[PDB]
Write a protein that binds this ligand. Sequence first.
Ligand SMILES: N[C@@H](CCC(=O)N[C@@H](CS)C(=O)NCC(=O)O)C(=O)O
Length: 215
Amino acid sequence: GAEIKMPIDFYQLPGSPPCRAVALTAAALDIEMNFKQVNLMNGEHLKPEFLKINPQHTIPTIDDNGFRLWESRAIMTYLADQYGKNDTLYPKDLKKRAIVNQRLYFDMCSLYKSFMDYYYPIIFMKAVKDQAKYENIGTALSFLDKFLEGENYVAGKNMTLADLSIVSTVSTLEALDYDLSKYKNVTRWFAKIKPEIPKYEEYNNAGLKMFKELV
Ligand SMILES: N[C@@H](CCC(=O)N[C@@H](CS)C(=O)NCC(=O)O)C(=O)O
């Protein structure tokens, strides 16, 4: 507003699944953001400069010309509506939109949740492997496989934000040698979607390399 617009500042760490979800969304929208690395491993998110941007000290965070937003999936739907050029990535139709939203909550409350509850303690807290938490991943993947039965995408007939959200989680599971082979709809979708996602190699795999690096 009455201001020279600048690129969106994107506070992120390449390996982070929720940051990759946002990065893939920007790529799909043909948005060039200003990538600002926040090194969580030496506490850059806890410095006064970042706490002023986000008092919750989480990434991803965007600063869109003074508008500060965090929660990856809220960023995704903001960018899609504010900068979208088609009506397929986040449909305006309320029922189609609701299914996309449902799948984003499923990702955050079930799939990504189960992934993190199991792997993060084992890796970065030297925790003992908990079989029940491991099995919660399979439970979530079983539901994802059901959602994909007879479907090409996770939330409708075209690629949507929900595919970008969920692929950031599923590709991290693959990177950690989780056996996805029994979920045949998931593996079909996964092989199918990667060539369709703009900048998948640059924005997802290159970061996943940094992820396997640090683990
Ligand atoms: N629900 C949040 C999760 C964000 C999150 O957990 N970010 C982690 C990195 S993957 C973080 O910034 N941890 C540092 C902290 O919370 O202090 C989202 O989807 O954006």
